Design a protein around this ligand. Structure first.
Ligand SMILES: Cc1cn([C@H]2C[C@H](O)[C@@H](COP(=O)(O)OP(=O)(O)OP(=O)(O)O)O2)c(=O)[nH]c1=O
Ligand SMILES: Cc1cn([C@H]2C[C@H](O)[C@@H](COP(=O)(O)OP(=O)(O)OP(=O)(O)O)O2)c(=O)[nH]c1=O
Ligand SMILES: Cc1cn([C@H]2C[C@H](O)[C@@H](COP(=O)(O)OP(=O)(O)OP(=O)(O)O)O2)c(=O)[nH]c1=O
Ligand SMILES: Cc1cn([C@H]2C[C@H](O)[C@@H](COP(=O)(O)OP(=O)(O)OP(=O)(O)O)O2)c(=O)[nH]c1=O
Ligand SMILES: Cc1cn([C@H]2C[C@H](O)[C@@H](COP(=O)(O)OP(=O)(O)OP(=O)(O)O)O2)c(=O)[nH]c1=O
Ligand SMILES: Cc1cn([C@H]2C[C@H](O)[C@@H](COP(=O)(O)OP(=O)(O)OP(=O)(O)O)O2)c(=O)[nH]c1=O
Ligand SMILES: [Mg+2]
Ligand SMILES: [Mg+2]
Ligand SMILES: [Mg+2]
Ligand SMILES: [Mg+2]
Ligand SMILES: [Mg+2]
Ligand SMILES: [Mg+2]
Ligand SMILES: [Zn+2]
Ligand SMILES: [Zn+2]
Ligand SMILES: [Zn+2]
Ligand SMILES: [Zn+2]
Ligand SMILES: [Zn+2]
Ligand SMILES: [Zn+2]
Ligand SMILES: [Zn+2]
Ligand SMILES: [Zn+2]
Ligand SMILES: [Zn+2]
Ligand SMILES: [Zn+2]
Ligand SMILES: [Zn+2]
Ligand SMILES: [Zn+2]
Lengths: 144, 144, 144, 144, 144, 144
């Protein structure tokens, strides 16, 4: 079980806690092969979740949740854990807002499973910050 | 000079460092009357700023910058400084995205200089998180 | 996917990285539903593992490895991460030595997949430290 | 009063708090000539001590206590103080279990007063981790 | 608005909270262009202030307050924030006691607005510690 | 060997490292019966000590050194170790300046070996901060 595979396995696993059915996304922040924070797609802690009260629609989009990647950063902010010089493992490549936040927090590498359209501006930013992005599949694993 | 005036003063002050001339915004995160982090409206660190290379326009707004409030939070995440049970002073009441993140981070009070229209969804979230929001003016001070 | 299932799942998962084929053990330390540290059954970092150079046998058992539970604790010590008032998820209920250390470290709950015979001395210590111990199964999950 | 002598003086001194009369052992973790944690030979905090209720005998050995060296590491784990890149001062050279834990926590040097039989495997591990072990006497000091 | 100017602006601003009218002094500790602690001239927190009960005179001097510079260091001590490798911005160059404390805490540079008589011993200490001291004016800024 | 005797013993012990022969002072900061910082009477780190280059006399006293109690506090500031809600053990009851700083730092108890005349202003401050002060002797111990 390789380190890369373990972290993607974990991204996949925490994505399963997503509480807005329009997106199951998971994210894992890693420093020297340790998990230091994780996120999934869900509403503000101790507020309503889409699963229970329905989506918060605006402009044909649901806006209730904090994204998985942003949630991982906000865990670090909340708990006072350093995100600097970490790397992230995500089920889906991040939106441009999340990317900007990840790069600003000092995330040095992004490994993703799926990706649909990567923002060119996200690619420009990653180039300037010398941050690599690399696809890797979720390992086939069975537990229980 | 009151604590409230000191912090709003420093919000205004940091707002001036904004590097996108479409919005001068400043944010000050505070725990037990100490400034623990600040943000202004700016592009990702060590990348191009609008002041230098122009705006990054999309659907009519500039997407180059991280917002001041988000930047303050990302400082906490990057440096591993706890934002839990803090309050924030902002020159402008936050967008819904920033509001979500501040609340997720454990911010318990938002003091703002100018608010324009507070999103009903933001009022709902703040109600559920029992977060106080209050207008306060930038004090008149002359330095030098 | 429940919090309990998520953590036991991740215990099983990290257990697979064990580098001594006589015991596959995994440990997950948790504070406020965040993973703060993990351990597996392995030799001292940057030294020989059994997988590569054989076991270090003595009086009929291998002494090369640090146990998974102890490794999780040592991660906390090495990195200066607080293990106080945490809980742990382990694939196997800990030996008496590990039990002592977890309790000394401030661990307040032990959730285990398989326990075999819990030492009477361990029951005494857990009673005095008011530490709960509870069996929970590895959930059935397929990844990929 | 040399730094080496001060730390050994301290090891000796904290060994005096040992609550199992079958071993008076003291340990001091040091980073840049500062004491960051200490340990002595005693049972789990807030549980019974040998001094009061008798030894916990098994296999002709007392197993009630956490060793001094392990207690120093567990203080770091408990309080979230980093043991990485520290050095330790101990009254007696550590057993193999303790040695493995010390090396795993990033302890870089071991200075001991007495030593009886050093485990060859402990010597192999110390060689591989490039960790030196050096005898030094307790200074003759009188206070009061 | 330059970084130097922003920090001096802040020193000036926090000096305005001074609660002994015989000295309005402000100090700002900075690490990588972030404010990590500030101080002003005032009595021990939660004790009487000169503004309310009068000065504490001894030897023709008021001795009630902790100096601004020392208060900034003591905030770091109190809150457990590292002052090592910081730089300080102060309205007035520090007395010799404060200077010794600043250099001992690892402050690497002192930028001051006014200065009356710099202690030669302070200059000797700054030379030995390779710490530069540099005058800079408070920027002319108007808010509100 | 009691906790109180252990700490006073270590105050005496560190006092011996003083590098100004006009005063041998030692300070030990303690949180939950752990030593978190110590100070002795000494010049700024990596500068000249009196032992080597003579005293720095002014108005009849030596001003070269940082006092032991202040040094203990500055260790906390430098290293980012929290001195809040600690207690201190000192060989001599502190000067008024040190008293102010300890109290500002959140020290809640002063245990001292020798006090000579406690400043009325110090009694006032300690009363307002509800800080206990208590005499305790250096225990008789012989090491080696
Ligand atoms: C604990 C934790 C929460 N979060 C985020 C995801 C959600 O947006 C939010 C939920 O926090 P909570 O509401 O406190 O968690 P919960 O046990 O109630 O689970 P849920 O509401 O999802 O049923 O916090 C993380 O991103 N990572 C984490 O490790
Ligand atoms: C230091 C600091 C930066 N930031 C943010 C604002 C910007 O988006 C980004 C810029 O960081 P940098 O590019 O590293 O700062 P700079 O000195 O180059 O100043 P600038 O580029 O603005 O001319 O970081 C804060 O929000 N708070 C802070 O305390
Ligand atoms: C990173 C990490 C290591 N460890 C422990 C397990 C092993 O005993 C030891 C190995 O660390 P390393 O030797 O540094 O890790 P590695 O990448 O070489 O993997 P391996 O040697 O196992 O093939 O550290 C944890 O318990 N938790 C962790 O998060
Ligand atoms: C405070 C402290 C405790 N310990 C360990 C040693 C013992 O195994 C255990 C005792 O903690 P406690 O029982 O909390 O300490 P105590 O005041 O009751 O003293 P004792 O029980 O020994 O009479 O904690 C250290 O190793 N280092 C330390 O600095
Ligand atoms: C919060 C804070 C306090 N201090 C110091 C300055 C004063 O000596 C002391 C006052 O703390 P407090 O008395 O707790 O602050 P306050 O709100 O009562 O204001 P004041 O008493 O001045 O009216 O703490 C700093 O130096 N920096 C800081 O950031
Ligand atoms: C390491 C340490 C230093 N100090 C203070 C005391 C001195 O004022 C100053 C000296 O630090 P250094 O000069 O770095 O220590 P040293 O090994 O050179 O010893 P010395 O100069 O005394 O012979 O730092 C403490 O108060 N506590 C500590 O734990
Ligand atoms: Mg919830
Ligand atoms: Mg820049
Ligand atoms: Mg290895
Ligand atoms: Mg006890
Ligand atoms: Mg006050
Ligand atoms: Mg020296
Ligand atoms: Zn939704
Ligand atoms: Zn996103
Ligand atoms: Zn722009
Ligand atoms: Zn915003
Ligand atoms: Zn083996
Ligand atoms: Zn074990
Ligand atoms: Zn015993
Ligand atoms: Zn041992
Ligand atoms: Zn006064
Ligand atoms: Zn001063
Ligand atoms: Zn002298
Ligand atoms: Zn003093």
């Amino acid at each position: 079980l390789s380190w890369q595979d373990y972290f993607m396995a974990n991204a996949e696993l925490i994505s399963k806690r997503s509480t807005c059915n329009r997106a199951y996304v998971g994210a894992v922040l890693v420093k020297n092969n340790r998990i230091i924070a994780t996120g999934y797609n869900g509403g503000v802690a101790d507020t309503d979740n889409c699963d229970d009260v329905g989506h918060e629609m605006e402009d044909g989009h649901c806006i209730r949740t904090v994204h998985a990647e942003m949630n991982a950063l906000i865990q670090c902010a909340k708990e006072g854990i350093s995100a600097n010089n970490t790397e992230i493992y995500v089920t889906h490549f991040p939106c441009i807002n999340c990317t900007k936040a990840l790069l600003q927090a000092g995330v040095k590498k992004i490994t993703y499973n799926t990706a649909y359209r990567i923002h060119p501006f996200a690619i420009e930013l990653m180039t300037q910050k010398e941050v690599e992005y690399v696809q890797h599949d979720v390992p086939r694993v069975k537990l229980g």
